[PDB]
Ligand binder design. Structure first.
Ligand SMILES: CC(C)[C@@H](CN1CC[C@@](C)(c2cccc(O)c2)[C@@H](C)C1)NC(=O)[C@H]1Cc2ccc(O)cc2CN1
Lengths: 339, 223, 286, 55
């Protein structure tokens, strides 16, 4: 009866949490938004189409600046693009052809690579010998890695398939902390701009806030009803929007952890593969399985434009840190840059 | 323009040429999705530390097969099955001798029923509308004496036939073939083999050659 | 009365052939990717038909006026591009059938022998092979009069000399290497392709893959029929008026213009058939 | 097991006793951050040809 008593206590305390966050919502974001000037049509024509991939592209990541992004695809090649000149600087081979995550460090010296091989790959881009060489072979995850966003030059955060997030060290290869509490499988990871916290989404429609210095879940919230596979912070750091496989996008805040705004439309029934913000936070860019990309008013929850033009389903999009341009990757071995 | 920009353009063209000549052989490197139940004869098929997909590189008559054994992937299969659109065939190794025993440690479900559910899941995927399944039935040698004592009534109380080897193999064949819900674009190849039996490479070679004939009709514009 | 209808139908088929070939070239240039080995071949067919459809007003006006005010300025080029079209169409239909046969019967070596680079190499080789005949035609061109009506037509430059044996050897050689070796290769390759498709397991069922094989065989049969039945009576007419002697009979020229009408109708119907039948354009257009 | 239930109930108890303040102020400061940085965003207002180096 002790297990039943503990289950009842957890149920009533979660009910108390739900009642507290229900009474905490004095007003909704719609009735504060509805008296501002709307955003016009974002007729963003393509500028660069980074052709050269021979296989399906799953992930991309920018740097602190533009002009340099990394791209991951199942051809075993991790191409570092020169974005303005459409050129490519390095073509990194992979030991494993199964990749679905990649990242570009803020220092620009290390890149992430992982996938179904259950091993994170870190390569040193700047070496006295002229080549791209792997530095640390990060293993310890029994599931497939799915998101490998970088803290800094020495700390890497990996989202994995064993329903646990992990923070590693480059020089030792061991996990400093193991973030545990996600029941479902995890394929979302986004770090806060102040590099103090991060949120992660999992299959159980749960977005959990974690602290990196001590490693425990500070808040969680369930508003979705399907697999969450796209997460990103608001650029102010006090909110984060969630993209799931539910044909909807939802916005949560770090201060109340409630349903601020949902982004769902009748004409779209396909899932979202990636979601990212611009540096102002007014526009929310949501990828879709409808073979296109769609932008969203992050306050008015209206469609501000469609970046149609992909021959296949998109899988990754990233707006640059200076708000310059978005590079939407897709399954058709293309990577279109929009402005 | 500037000399550094011209050098960068030349390096980009050189590495594009290298990427083209390295990815042109990926079409010749044909690839197979090997999957099956645990200890169901999958370990002995591959003879003819990443803790993930095991890569085996082997060739027969200059074709360079690749097998992706997913035996060490304990995660949810639905979210990583979309990375195998480029696979040409599905190898499904299941054992015929695993019809009576349920787990050999607990009693809640037979191994054959879970294998049938896995085949129905992997055969009716929207990702595999036109990926021909090379079904394999192995370790028939242990099934020869295990059918003399135990009938099919342990596994199926709807058999009502003859408790013999050939009819048992044919009825397992009939259950597995009828799991396919669309027989027009999908064809399921089956081979009978043992743990010490050869001529599996011939069956898989014939399979891959037929699928690439279908591909060659498809790109030329006839199929 | 009599020339009113036939010239109108000729102009109509000329216009529809031009517009069909123009739309085929436009979609293969800017709407359908050109990477498949058969894409460059249907491109070659489009280009050859575009080069030969231009001579249709020339044929119409020479049928009308029974002569031409053209001189040696352009009869030489419109008689060189005739043989250029002939060799191009024949060798592309041969190499397309060879490519299909090596795709079906040898699929393990089709991945190596069906690279786009090798397709371009074979295409340039057959382009040069047609161009040798084209430059031979352009250096053995010219005109002369006939002393019954004093009209003019441009043909091979061979005066009254001991070159008649050479002219018959040239005509018999182009006949053999046009409708013996290429048609024999096309027929043998397609029959062996269907024979290999007998033994496969994904196209020899009973529900829909059997009728898929049936429509594929109907496709190759109708392609061979449209090529042969339309291009062959030309070869009967010219080979009949090569070995012996044939004057300008009224039944001869009527059959001559009938055969020319067929040999232009096939080139007009090739873009429409290869756009509504090749199924890659059907997949792209949807 | 029972240890998993103890861990979950303690983790949820830790998440229970956190500070929660009004959602309307979160909407207000989200709107304030959006309007205060709307000028510094080329995706909102398109920069001219001298700027916008994707040309
Ligand atoms: C392909 C079809 C439609 C026509 C096209 N061709 C195009 C040139 C043409 C209009 C012409 C050219 C020069 C003078 C003249 O009065 C007429 C007239 C001969 C018709 N081709 C021919 O008549 C070809 C057919 C042929 C076949 C075998 C062979 O040994 C030689 C020749 C030469 N004439």
């Amino acid at each position: 009866s002790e297990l039943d008593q503990l289950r009842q206590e957890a149920e009533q305390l979660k009910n108390q949490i739900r009642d507290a966050r229900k009474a905490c919502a004095d007003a909704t974001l719609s009735q504060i938004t509805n008296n501002i000037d709307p955003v016009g049509r974002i007729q963003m024509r393509t500028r660069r189409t980074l052709r050269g991939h021979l296989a399906k592209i799953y992930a991309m990541h920018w740097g602190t600046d533009s002009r340099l992004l990394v791209s991951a695809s199942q051809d075993g090649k991790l191409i570092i693009w020169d974005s303005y000149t459409t050129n490519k600087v390095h073509a990194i081979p992979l030991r494993s052809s199964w990749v679905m995550t990649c990242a570009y460090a803020p220092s620009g010296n290390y890149v992430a690579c992982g996938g179904l091989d259950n091993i994170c790959s870190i390569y040193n881009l700047k070496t006295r010998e002229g080549n791209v060489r792997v530095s640390r072979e990060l293993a310890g995850h029994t599931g497939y890695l799915s998101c490998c966003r970088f803290l800094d030059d020495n700390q890497i955060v990996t989202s994995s398939g064993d329903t646990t997030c992990a923070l590693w060290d480059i020089e030792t290869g061991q996990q400093t902390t193991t973030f545990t509490g996600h029941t479902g499988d995890v394929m979302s990871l986004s770090l806060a701009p102040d590099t103090r916290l991060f949120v992660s989404g999992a299959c159980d429609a749960s977005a959990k806030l974690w602290d990196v210095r001590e490693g425990m879940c500070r808040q969680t919230f369930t508003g979705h009803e399907s697999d969450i596979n796209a997460i990103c912070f608001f650029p102010n750091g006090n909110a984060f929007a969630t993209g799931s496989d539910d044909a909807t996008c939802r916005l949560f805040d770090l201060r109340a952890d409630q349903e601020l705004m949902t982004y769902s439309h009748d004409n779209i029934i396909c899932g979202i593969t990636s979601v990212s913000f611009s540096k102002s936070g007014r526009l929310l860019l949501a990828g879709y399985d409808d073979f296109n990309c769609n932008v969203w008013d992050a306050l008015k929850a209206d469609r501000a434009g469609v970046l149609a033009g992909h021959d296949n389903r998109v899988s990754c999009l990233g707006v640059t840190d200076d708000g310059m341009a978005v590079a939407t990757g897709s399954w058709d071995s293309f990577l279109k840059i929009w402005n | 323009l500037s000399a550094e920009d011209k050098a960068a353009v030349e390096r980009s063209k050189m590495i594009d040429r290298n990427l083209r000549e390295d990815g042109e052989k990926a079409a010749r490197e044909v690839k197979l999705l090997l999957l099956g139940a645990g200890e169901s004869g999958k370990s002995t098929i591959v003879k003819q530390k990443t803790t993930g997909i095991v890569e085996t590189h082997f060739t027969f008559k200059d074709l360079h097969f690749k097998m992706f054994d997913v035996g060490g992937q304990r995660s949810e299969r639905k979210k990583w099955i979309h990375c195998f659109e480029g696979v040409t065939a599905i190898i499904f190794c299941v054992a015929l001798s695993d019809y009576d025993l349920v787990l050999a440690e607990d009693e809640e479900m037979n191994r054959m029923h879970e294998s049938m559910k896995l085949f129905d899941s992997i055969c009716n995927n929207k990702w595999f509308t036109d990926t021909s399944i090379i079904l394999f039935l192995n370790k028939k040698d242990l099934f020869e004496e295990k059918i003399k004592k135990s009938p099919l009534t342990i596994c199926y109380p709807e058999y009502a036939g003859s408790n013999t080897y050939e009819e048992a193999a044919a009825y397992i064949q009939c259950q597995f073939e009828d799991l396919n819900k669309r027989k027009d674009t999908k064809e399921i190849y089956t081979h009978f083999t043992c743990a010490t039996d050869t001529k599996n490479v011939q069956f898989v070679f014939d399979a891959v050659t037929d699928v690439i004939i279908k591909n060659n009709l498809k790109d030329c514009g006839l199929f | 009365a009599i020339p009113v209808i036939i010239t109108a139908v000729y102009s109509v088929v000329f216009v529809v052939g031009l517009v069909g070939n123009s739309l085929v070239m436009f979609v293969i240039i800017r709407y359908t990717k050109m990477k498949t080995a058969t894409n460059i071949y249907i491109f070659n067919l489009a280009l050859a038909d575009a080069l030969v459809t231009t001579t249709m007003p020339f044929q119409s006006t020479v049928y009308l006026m029974n002569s031409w005010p053209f001189g040696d300025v352009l009869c030489k080029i419109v008689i060189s591009i005739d043989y250029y079209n002939m060799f191009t169409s024949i060798f592309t239909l041969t190499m397309m059938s060879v490519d299909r046969y090596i795709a079906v019967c040898h699929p393990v070596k089709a991945l190596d022998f069906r690279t786009p680079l090798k397709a371009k190499i074979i295409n340039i080789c057959i382009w040069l092979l047609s161009s040798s005949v084209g430059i031979s035609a352009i250096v053995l061109g010219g005109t002369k009069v006939r002393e019954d009506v004093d009209v003019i037509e441009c043909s091979l430059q061979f005066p009254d000399d001991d070159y008649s044996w050479w002219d018959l050897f040239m005509k018999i050689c182009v006949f053999i290497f046009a409708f013996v070796i290429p048609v024999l290769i096309i027929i043998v390759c397609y029959t062996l392709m269907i024979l290999r498709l007998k033994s496969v397991r994904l196209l020899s069922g009973s529900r829909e893959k059997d009728r898929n094989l049936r429509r594929i065989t109907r496709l190759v049969l109708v392609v061979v029929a449209v090529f042969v039945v339309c291009w062959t009576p030309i070869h009967i007419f010219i080979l009949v008026e090569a070995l012996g002697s044939t004057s300008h009979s009224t039944a001869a020229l009527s059959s001559y213009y009938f055969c020319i009408a067929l040999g232009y109708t096939n080139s007009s119907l090739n873009p429409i058939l290869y756009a509504f039948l090749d199924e890659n354009f059907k997949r792209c257009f949807r | 097991s029972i240890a998993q239930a103890r861990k979950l109930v303690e983790q949820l108890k830790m998440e229970a006793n956190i500070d929660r303040i009004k959602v309307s102020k979160a909407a207000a400061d989200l709107m304030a951050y959006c309007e205060a940085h709307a000028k510094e965003d080329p995706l909102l207002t398109p920069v001219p040809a001298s700027e916008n180096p994707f040309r």
